[PDB]
Design a binder for these strands. Structure first.
Lengths: 120, 112, 43, 48
RNA sequence: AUGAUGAGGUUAAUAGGUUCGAGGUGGAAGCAUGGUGACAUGUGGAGCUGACGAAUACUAAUCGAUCGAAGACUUAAU
RNA sequence: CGCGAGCUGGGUUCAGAACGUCGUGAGACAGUUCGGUCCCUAUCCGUCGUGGGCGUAGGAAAUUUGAGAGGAGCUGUCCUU
RNA sequence: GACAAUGGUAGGAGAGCGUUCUAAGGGCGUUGAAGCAUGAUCGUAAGGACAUGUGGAGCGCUUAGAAGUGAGAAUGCCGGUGUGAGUAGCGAAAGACGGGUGAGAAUCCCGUCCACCGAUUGACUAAGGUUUCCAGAGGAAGGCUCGUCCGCUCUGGGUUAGU
RNA sequence: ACCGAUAGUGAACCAGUACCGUGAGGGAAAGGUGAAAAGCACCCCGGAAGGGGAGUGAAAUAGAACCUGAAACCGUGUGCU
RNA sequence: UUAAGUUAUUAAGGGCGCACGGUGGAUGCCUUGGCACUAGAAGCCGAUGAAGGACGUUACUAACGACGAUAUGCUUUGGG
């Protein structure tokens, strides 16, 4: 696995805040190495959502930050409720995948390979 | 007929701008735009702005066919520098050269 | 590390400055020498 | 630590012959737009 | 280190994911029972598991572009 | 008395202090004793690895020959005779 | 016309070449002076011409005066300009994403999440600093990167006491 | 038979002034558009800077860093290698 | 064809020569300013408040000159 230029806890906190925001907005723009590594994080977290039992509800809350989505008609679900409720219903037949990585050009301040990671 | 444009006193240093400027010379005007849009150097939005200006002086001032033009000359001269200082250690300053460039590309169709 | 010249608006005006130079003859000498250079600020 | 001699104009230019830069990918976007970088999705002025 | 080297690039198992393992940890949560309790026992070698193994095209190895030979004379046998 | 732009700094020529000794003295000894700042981003050569270029009279892929060069090279004990 | 001499440092002697100025004489110049650049020219030397560009107003020559009169060296002085070298560095530290802004955003704004200080990186208040304070506006330079931001720049404001 | 802008006063330039020092004190660098500002109306590229035209002027590589622009240095081309 | 032998073509880059640029401010010419003097004056004021300054004063105002509240000037006599 990749270390991403950070400590064991700075990488862990970065990687579950980057996996939460890819549940909120369903497509986020990051760098290429940070999307290679949150790829295996959120795909292991949709696997917990396809189960849907209480024991893996407790395991998806190991990872997900406490973020509240403002959904339509002013209703608010959490990112834990949105993982087992919407993404879990979309991929209940698909046996893998769940994300893609679309490469883009370098940034301006860096030569950082920009990447959109989407949720498919 | 030739069409030229210059960019005087561009704050990018002359060594840093002659890297990307060696990539586009001798090449036709259409693909030289595509090289300057894809290299991630700092100079690539600046030479591209000058290559836009010389292709525009060809179509407007000299009525050339801008579809078939080739970059003849693509050089960068030294401009006046800005001599800055820098405090290092034990009261001892060291000079920093803020170099500037005169970027010049000329474009033609090879006919007289 | 504490440097020299910890500033003080009272002491600077009282060991230097005009009413102190004028109080002694050798301080009117430093005023006459700065009037002769054309020095813009005295004292 | 310090250079005992100056490098000439000839020796300096022999050193930086590999101090170059490469041309990039430059693949066409067949849907619409200008040349995109190879294996990349476009953002502006293209349909990839 | 870089680049080189090697495995692959859809006619594809290259990597990830998924599925099944191996090894590791040592009995998950929830529930039930017992105990006034702290806790025990059952459910149950249980859950969990980074690099390891196998399977699987689910995702990504797109479309493309560049380079690359035309075989010199001389004499000798043939 | 190989090797400090590879390392330590115990030894010693630094400023402190003390004894012995010498000098009227300030001091001194080459007598002791305690303490006492070790700078350098490697240009060239040379070395340890590693690429690119070109040549090898067609261009490639693969297997090799070895001109050469380098590495290795020590020894005890015991038992039979 | 013979004959003879001619390595050379301290050093001695001799003869010169250029430089600026002066005097007299004689001149040359917008039909392009001095400079500058180039050239395959001449003289034994220091040097002298000529041609052609550039250049846009002065300057040669002869004789004789005068000297701030000749540079490669002084760890010279003052200017530029390299080399090292695209090398060292970029000054303690956690950010991430979305939205927005715009010629342009890893850095600007907003939002959420995360993280850090918390006998303090929190509040006051002296000294000291002087306008940095506040609004718009700007992006040359300054900011060790960027910049649409700023303690920067531009314009206009802002400090009220019987206690 | 004084100086011509590294000279001549430190100072030909809003000089004992920026600046330095706690203070006495120390102390710079920085002249030249053209005859005349006639100082480039308009057009094009660009966010702007900058350019390319057009125009003024005897001249605009006289464009406000503006008389000439030497070398070091930086380039781009090449003929022979 | 096979031998045997000879000689190229390559320039990543470099060198020399040439051409064209850029930087840079030497040089040429120029002078507002200095330098050394000559001749003729004169030399030093102030409690009636000096030399020096500080703040001010123009329609717009930063600085410098100029002048102080009668302030980017007033009166008067003469030039013009």
């Amino acid at each position: 696995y990749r270390k991403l230029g950070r400590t064991s806890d700075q990488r862990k906190a970065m990687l579950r805040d980057l996996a939460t925001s890819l549940i909120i907005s369903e497509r986020i723009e990051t760098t290429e190495a940070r999307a290679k590594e949150v790829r295996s994080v959120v795909e292991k977290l949709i696997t917990l959502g396809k189960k849907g039992d209480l024991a893996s509800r407790r395991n998806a809350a190991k990872t997900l930050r406490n973020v509240e989505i403002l959904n339509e008609d002013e209703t608010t679900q959490t990112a834990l409720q949105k993982l087992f409720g919407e993404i879990a219903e979309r991929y209940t037949e698909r046996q893998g995948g769940y994300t893609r990585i679309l490469k883009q050009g370098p940034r301006r301040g860096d030569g950082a390979e920009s990447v959109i990671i989407e949720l498919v | 007929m030739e069409a030229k444009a210059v960019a005087r006193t561009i704050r990018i240093a002359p060594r840093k701008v002659r890297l990307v400027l060696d990539l586009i010379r001798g090449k036709n005007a259409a693909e030289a735009i595509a090289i300057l849009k894809l290299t991630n150097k700092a100079s690539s939005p600046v030479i591209e702005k000058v290559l836009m200006s010389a292709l525009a002086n060809a179509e407007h001032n000299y009525d050339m066919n801008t579809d078939e033009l080739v970059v003849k000359e693509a050089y960068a001269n030294e401009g006046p520098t800005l001599k800055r200082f820098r405090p290092r250690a034990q009261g001892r300053a060291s000079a920093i050269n803020k170099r500037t460039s005169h970027i010049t590309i000329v474009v033609s169709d090879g006919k007289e | 590390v504490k440097r020299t010249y910890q500033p003080n608006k009272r002491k600077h005006s009282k060991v230097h400055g005009f009413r102190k130079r004028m109080s002694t003859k050798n301080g009117r000498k430093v005023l006459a020498r700065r009037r002769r250079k054309g020095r813009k600020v005295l004292s | 630590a310090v250079p005992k001699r100056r490098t000439s104009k000839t020796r300096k230019n022999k050193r930086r012959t590999h101090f170059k830069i490469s041309v990039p990918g430059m693949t066409e976007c067949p849907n619409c737009g200008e040349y995109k970088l190879s294996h990349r999705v476009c953002k502006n002025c293209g349909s990839y």
